[PDB]
């Protein structure tokens, strides 16, 4: 009857290799844990039954142990199990009030594998009794007990002080999220000494990682009630604000993990600076596919000031995420310098063009020529266009490679948007810069200056050595270098979870608890360093190296002075930096970055201003070419592990017939390759300046070696004849691979057919750049391009208007109209339909669409896509797929009302498709579409409930908390009416106006067709912006009846009263906007 190995902030009871609690002792052997305060609880039990872990430490003498249950202990892991009265078990996540971090671990040195059982305590208000047994199993009648365990978690919280967002269930539940609904809200309110927790549903993971140890720098205001002041360093009651050494700064050749863990980091230290009791699952949460990503933390007792921040769940399978708002309820700023006094401002960028083939002085002498030509076509459309701007350019021009541009959001220029007002110091400012950048565009952001950390180490190295730091721990497909107490085996996965931020090398670990590390600069910034690397995401931090695959960090340039040298991308050290937007991007998710300023070294919201910057990046849908060597490593992992079903990569990864080291890549124009090799591991580093040539000797080339690529002779073209600009700067050790591209036209003069150049990477894989006569035949047959300007069809009795598309670019037909442009001018209420194929239909197996979606990515400016609702609100969308003919159709009915001249373009392309006829090859073609609308007529006689639609509906009801309305509408024949309600709302009755109440018939639900057979209908259940709309038009109805609808919600209701009556109260003014 005693206690165990309770270790205050850590809890452990090791029965595997602990002399205290091992079978070696012939006396009482048991342990007890009074766990508490969001701290880990480790149980390191012996092997129960022959398990596939190791041998020797699990010899025959040590193998006769067994106790129920012997469940799965490999990489696949279920919730930790706790034994009960019946000698059976129950899940620990329910035995205790919501356990998290239930993972198994083993020791590696000398193969001392043991079934380590770690789990982090959740909020608990009572003393919970969990009891185990430890039993020896030699054989029947020889089963003898030798110990037991007893977990006795204690009270540490109260129901009132604990707030939780159980995202699994509720109106805000994230499970129901789909392609149409992406996010739902939740919040936790915490006053002095409160408790907050997060629990993403199964299938989600918590981001940003290390939360809440480091969180957003949103708000920071002091409170007079505080009893202890703040220091911002490792001193006082906090233990953070130091940087790693032996994980990222000290590397060796054998370290191959550098680019595989650049996922999420770089968050600020405020919560640590604020003494917050932060607990996190590090960068590797539970196996969330069958577990809940959960975390907990507590408000510090001695600290009562104001802070704001948030963290998010995430899942890319359905583009669904959930935001978690965290704030201090003790908001002691409700009257001074709060959100009301926070001035909101906006900024526009300065635009230039990147030096794709130019140098420094060219920035002033030559890039003007590049800049002064692109916008001429946009000017032509703005002014010259009168009917329709077809693609009449068919000689002496190129488009794809010339669209590169550069954008800059300088705040040192616009000091007013980030600095305090010179005299009106009674307010604080907030600013937001918007950049609508596109592919092949360099984005460089300028902000105030703030520098990085500077760790230190000290020790009297003499007559002493530290050789007890050689051990690793393996769990969940990964091996970690960590440390263990020699006797008590007291450590933590929390230490492992934070090991991404710390490391130990040599013998210098003297007095770490007292550190006052500071930056070399004073100004506040978020993130502290490399903002363009750890890009902000509004209220979320992510690393751009892995989040945006293929991104290149471009060197900063404050000034090209006489002392200029090879600078770097480090921000905000010099306040300048640059990145490149890859042509291919996984998703359209936008990114941000924060900038700030202050007066002294210890400032806050009382003496600081906040600025924001926005840069948009386009998505992509077509897979890249090239070999991903890390994908070959993933294949070897698939050999290693079995639960890697999600084997998805963004590269086609062309495969040789028998060989894997070979990468037979064909240099095809109008294609992008993605050969992925870490940093400059590509060998030779001068490649392709120095390459090795092998010849077509073996068609499969199964018998090849990478080391052979060292002895070859080259006398063709030359060595230094063509030079390009720098596109890889290894100064940042987290840079991506080089990019290779080609223009719209290609030349056949310099090709070598029966020989291939090669380069090597990872010492195993071989790159092969080949060219085939098929490409030359394709270009020689496709160069002769014919363009036809056709017109569409229509009807007036039905008010229909549609074009013919699919019958034009068939690749199995002889072409005399290799390209066709379709322009069709429409008006209000016109139902446009677009028929296009996919990359599966016969003769269309390689069809792709540009822009990347007809419904949400149309073009508004020349070669610059934008959503339809951003400039053409109230547009109905319906994308469908045919059952048999593999035909994709879209509906693009124009909104009833338009206030300005409108003309947008959206194209198609089938040049990648071909077919074989009579042993001859017939290739694909290209097509384009243009639409013209102009203003509308008889603006909607209804009411809007979203505000932004104020120019489309007569009434614009801006929603307010617990609002009510009576939208009475009286319309006649040929009169347009409708309403718009928020998507999150529910239409009661459903499907209005399709089925509506009756004003006079006791609000009886009546079908729209039954009410009047001449009523055309069209509905928008949801749209991208998040609104719901309904449309109705009456056409020559010989009756005057009434009906009603109602938009309803928990905190908002809107009633629509409708009566049909011919009338005219318009003098036809039709307010004339010259635009």
């Amino acid at each position: 009857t005693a206690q165990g190995i309770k270790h205050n902030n850590v809890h452990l009871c090791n029965f595997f290799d602990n002399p205290e609690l091992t079978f070696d002792n012939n006396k009482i052997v048991l342990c007890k844990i009074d766990a508490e305060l969001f701290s880990e609880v480790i149980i390191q039990l012996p092997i129960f039954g022959t398990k596939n872990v190791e041998e020797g430490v699990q010899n025959e003498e040590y193998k006769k142990f067994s106790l129920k249950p012997s469940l799965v202990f490999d990489d696949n892991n279920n919730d930790i199990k706790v034994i009960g009265k019946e000698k059976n078990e129950v899940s620990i996540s329910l035995a205790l009030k919501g356990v998290y971090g239930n993972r198994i671990f083993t020791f590696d040195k000398n193969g001392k594998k043991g079934e380590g059982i770690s789990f982090f305590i959740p909020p608990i208000k009572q003393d919970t009794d969990l009891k185990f047994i430890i039993n020896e199993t030699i054989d029947n009648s020889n089963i003898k007990q030798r110990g037991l365990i007893y977990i006795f978690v204690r009270k540490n919280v109260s129901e009132n002080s604990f707030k939780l967002c159980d995202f699994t269930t509720g109106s805000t539940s994230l499970m129901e999220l789909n392609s149409q609904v992406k996010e739902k809200k939740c919040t936790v309110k915490i006053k002095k000494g409160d408790i907050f927790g997060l629990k993403c549903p199964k299938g989600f993971a918590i981001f940003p990682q290390a939360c809440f140890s480091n969180v957003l720098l949103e708000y920071y205001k002091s409170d007079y009630e505080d009893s202890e002041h703040i220091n911002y360093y490792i001193h006082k009651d906090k233990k953070y604000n130091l940087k790693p050494k032996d994980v990222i700064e000290l590397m060796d050749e054998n370290f191959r993990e550098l680019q595989n863990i650049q996922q999420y980091t770089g968050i600020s230290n405020i919560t640590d600076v604020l003494h917050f009791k932060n607990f996190n699952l590090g960068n590797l949460p539970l196996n969330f596919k069958n577990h809940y990503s959960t975390a907990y933390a507590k408000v510090p007792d001695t600290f009562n000031s104001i802070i704001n921040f948030s963290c998010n769940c995430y899942n890319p399978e359905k583009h669904v995420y959930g935001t978690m708002q965290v704030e201090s309820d003790n908001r002691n700023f409700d009257n001074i310098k709060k959100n009301e006094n926070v001035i909101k401002n906006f900024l526009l960028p300065n635009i230039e063009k990147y030096a794709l083939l130019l140098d420094d002085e060219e920035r002033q002498k030559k890039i003007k020529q590049q800049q002064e030509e692109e916008q001429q076509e946009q000017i032509l459309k703005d002014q010259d266009d009168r009917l329709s701007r077809h693609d009449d350019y068919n000689k002496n021009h190129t488009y794809i490679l010339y669209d590169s541009n550069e954008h800059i959001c300088d705040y040192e220029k616009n000091e007013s948007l980030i600095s305090t007002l010179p005299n009106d110091t009674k307010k604080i400012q907030k600013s937001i810069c918007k950049i609508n950048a596109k592919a092949l565009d360099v984005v460089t952001i300028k902000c105030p200056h703030t520098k990085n950390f500077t760790p230190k180490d000290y020790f009297p190295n003499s007559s002493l050595i530290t050789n007890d730091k050689k051990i690793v721990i393996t769990f969940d497909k990964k091996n970690f270098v960590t440390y263990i107490d020699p006797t008590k085996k007291t450590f933590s996965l929390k230490d492992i979870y934070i090991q991404s931020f710390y490391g130990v090398s040599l013998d210098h670990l003297n007095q770490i608890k007292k550190i006052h590390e500071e930056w070399d600069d004073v100004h506040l910034f978020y993130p502290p360093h490399n903002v363009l690397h750890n890009v902000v995401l509004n209220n979320h931090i992510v690393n751009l190296s892995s989040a945006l695959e293929g991104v290149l960090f471009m060197k900063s340039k404050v000034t090209g002075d006489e002392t200029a040298t090879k600078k770097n991308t480090t921000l905000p050290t010099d306040g300048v930096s640059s990145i490149l937007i890859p042509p291919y991007v996984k998703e359209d998710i936008t990114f941000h970055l924060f900038c700030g300023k202050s007066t002294t070294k210890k400032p806050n919201k009382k003496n600081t201003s906040l600025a924001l910057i926005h840069i948009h990046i386009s998505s992509n849908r077509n897979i890249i070419h090239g070999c991903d060597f890390l994908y070959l490593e993933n294949q070897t992992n698939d050999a290693i592990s079995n639960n890697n079903n999600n084997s998805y990569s963004i590269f086609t990864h062309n495969k040789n017939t028998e060989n894997n080291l070979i990468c037979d890549i064909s240099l095809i124009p109008k294609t992008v390759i993605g050969i992925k090799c870490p940093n400059k591991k590509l060998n030779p580093q001068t490649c392709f300046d120095e390459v090795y040539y092998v010849k077509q000797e073996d068609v499969p080339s199964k018998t090849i070696t990478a080391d052979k690529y060292n002895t070859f002779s080259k006398d063709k073209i030359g060595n230094i004849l063509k030079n390009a600009i720098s596109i890889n700067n290894p100064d940042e050790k987290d840079n991506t691979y080089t990019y290779l591209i080609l223009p719209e036209k290609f030349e056949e003069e310099l090709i070598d057919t029966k020989k291939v150049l090669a380069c090597t990477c990872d010492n195993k894989y071989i790159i092969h750049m080949k060219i085939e006569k098929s490409t030359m035949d394709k270009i020689k047959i496709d160069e002769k391009k014919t363009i036809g300007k056709d017109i569409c069809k229509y009807d007036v009795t039905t008010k229909v208007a549609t074009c013919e598309i699919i019958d034009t670019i068939d690749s199995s037909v002889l072409k005399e109209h290799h390209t066709v442009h379709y322009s069709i001018t429409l008006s209000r209420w016109d139902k446009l339909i677009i028929k296009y194929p996919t990359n599966e239909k016969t003769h269309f197996e390689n069809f792709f669409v540009n822009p990347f979606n007809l419904k949400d990515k149309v073009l508004y400016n020349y070669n610059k896509p934008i959503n339809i609702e951003h400039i053409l609100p109230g547009a109905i969308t319906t994308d469908i797929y045919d059952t048999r003919t593999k035909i994709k159709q879209y509906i693009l009915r124009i909104p009833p009302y338009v206030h300005k001249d409108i003309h947008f373009s959206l194209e198609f392309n089938n040049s990648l498709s071909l077919t074989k006829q009579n042993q001859n090859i017939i290739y694909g073609n290209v097509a384009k579409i243009f639409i013209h609308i102009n203003q509308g007529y008889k603006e909607i006689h209804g009411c809007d409930f979203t505000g932004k639609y104020s120019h489309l509906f007569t009434y614009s009801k801006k929603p307010l908390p617990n609002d009510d309305d009576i939208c009475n509408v009286t319309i006649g024949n040929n009169t347009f009416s409708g309403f718009a309600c928020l998507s999150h709302f529910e239409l009661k009755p459903n499907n209005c106006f399709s089925s509506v109440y009756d004003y006079n018939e006791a609000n009886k639900v009546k079908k729209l067709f039954d009410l009047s057979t001449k009523v055309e209908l069209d509905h928008i259940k949801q749209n991208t912006s998040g609104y719901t709309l309904s449309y109705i038009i009456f056409n020559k109805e010989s009756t005057k009846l009434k009906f009603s609808c109602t938009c309803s919600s928990n905190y908002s209701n809107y009633t629509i009263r409708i009566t049909f009556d011919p009338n005219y109260i318009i003098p036809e003014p039709q307010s004339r906007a010259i635009i």
């Binding site: 229509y794 007036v796 001018t825 206030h899 203003q935 007529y937 009434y955 003098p1067 003014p1069 010259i1074």
Partner: protein, 401 residues
């Protein structure tokens, strides 16, 4: 049944509309934006019958750089657009007008002006919203202007007085003494504006009648105890009985309005074989009796300083586009949908007196022109039936431009 005239224009929820919005969130904001560079004119060139023209501006506390010129518009307005010469709006000679300044919204300030059709002379006043001084990275803002050319109504005013108040500036052609047996009957010429003064009128004053089928284009509005009745440009019969009831002095006064019948020869085209219909057309070219799908056309032309003409088209079948709310742009070798344009913009007149009728399968589209067009204009309406098409063209070469 009976209510004061002014109450008939308040029977609407929310707002009545017809606002020149130049706020930051308005129709065309003046903020520096790369998305637009052209000038802004919310011009409404037309007669005004107590019509509401409203200017929406951002709050100065939110946009101090946003200027209002004149600062008290519409209380003070400009008369010289090029020179911006400020004069009090009352000095313009506007008759029985009123202005409002509504600021019951934290997001914007509203200015509303109502103008009566009783100005003795044509009045043109301008208000300017200037944001070009917003120097953001040397990106100047845009300028907006509200053009309100209050044209004196181009017809005589037949005013009848049945109130205890005096209208100083009205002709006062008729009064209570002219009501025989509490009934007054008057004749109105094509387009004449009839005005009745009465404190208590029926809600259907001049809105209903016995033979007023030809009188429906009227934009009947009520204000200052006055009921304004804008006669349509064209009628087909003399007996167009439009009735109203006034309760002045507790007496059931009856007012009857009828046209000064003079059928206007339509300076248009008639593609229908029914050349003896209720309408008369200058040009006629029957679609029938035409074989081999032979196309027909008729080039109608008009040219006069002032226009009191009737232009329209009569043809069997369907008109593509459905004239006259949309008509083809004449500039094309083939007048296909690519040339679709609004007639209100094609001939630069928004006061077109539309008049549509149908006889069996014959679609008749007519519209009246009063005044003059600032520029020479032309339009074409195509009539198609089965396999044959008829081309209608009007060229209105007014003495302008």
């Amino acid at each position: 049944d009976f209510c004061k005239p002014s109450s008939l224009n308040s029977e609407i929820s929310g707002f009545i509309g017809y606002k020149c919005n130049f706020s930051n969130e308005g129709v065309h904001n003046l903020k520096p934006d790369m998305r637009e560079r052209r000038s802004i004119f919310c011009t409404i060139h037309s007669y005004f019958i107590y019509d509401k023209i409203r200017l929406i501006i951002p709050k100065k506390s939110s946009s101090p750089e946003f200027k209002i010129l004149p600062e008290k518009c519409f209380q003070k307005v400009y008369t010289d657009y090029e020179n911006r010469v400020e004069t009090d709006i009352s000095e313009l000679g506007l008759i029985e007008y009123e202005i409002e300044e509504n600021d019951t919204n934290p997001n914007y300030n509203e200015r509303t002006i109502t103008i009566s059709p009783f100005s003795p002379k044509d009045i043109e006043f301008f208000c300017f919203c200037d944001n070009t001084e917003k120097v953001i990275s040397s990106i100047e803002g845009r300028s907006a202007m509200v053009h309100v050319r209050v044209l004196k109504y181009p017809h005589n005013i037949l005013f009848t007085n049945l109130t205890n108040d005096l209208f100083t500036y009205l002709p006062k052609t008729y009064n209570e003494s002219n009501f025989v047996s509490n009934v007054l009957e008057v004749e109105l010429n094509d387009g004449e504006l009839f005005v009745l003064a009465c404190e208590l009128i029926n809600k259907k004053c001049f809105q209903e009648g016995k033979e007023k089928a030809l009188y429906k284009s009227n934009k009947i509005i009520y204000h200052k105890n006055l009921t304004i009745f804008k006669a349509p440009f064209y009628v087909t019969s003399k007996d167009v009985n439009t009735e109203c009831t006034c309760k002045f002095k507790n007496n059931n006064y009856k007012i009857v309005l009828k046209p000064k019948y003079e059928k206007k020869v339509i300076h248009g085209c008639n593609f229908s074989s029914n050349v003896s219909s209720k309408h008369t057309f200058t040009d006629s070219l029957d679609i029938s009796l035409v074989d081999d799908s032979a196309h027909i056309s008729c080039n109608v032309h008009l040219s006069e300083p002032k226009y009191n003409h009737l232009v329209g088209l009569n043809c069997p079948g369907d008109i593509i586009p459905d004239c006259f709310f949309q008509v083809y742009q004449p500039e094309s070798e083939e007048l296909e949908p690519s040339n679709i344009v609004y007639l209100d913009s094609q001939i630069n007149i928004g006061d077109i007196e539309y008049y549509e009728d149908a006889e069996g399968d014959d679609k008749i589209k007519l519209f009246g022109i009063v005044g003059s067009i600032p520029k020479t204009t032309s339009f074409t309406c195509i009539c198609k039936k089965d396999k044959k098409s008829a081309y209608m063209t009007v060229t209105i070469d007014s003495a302008y431009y």
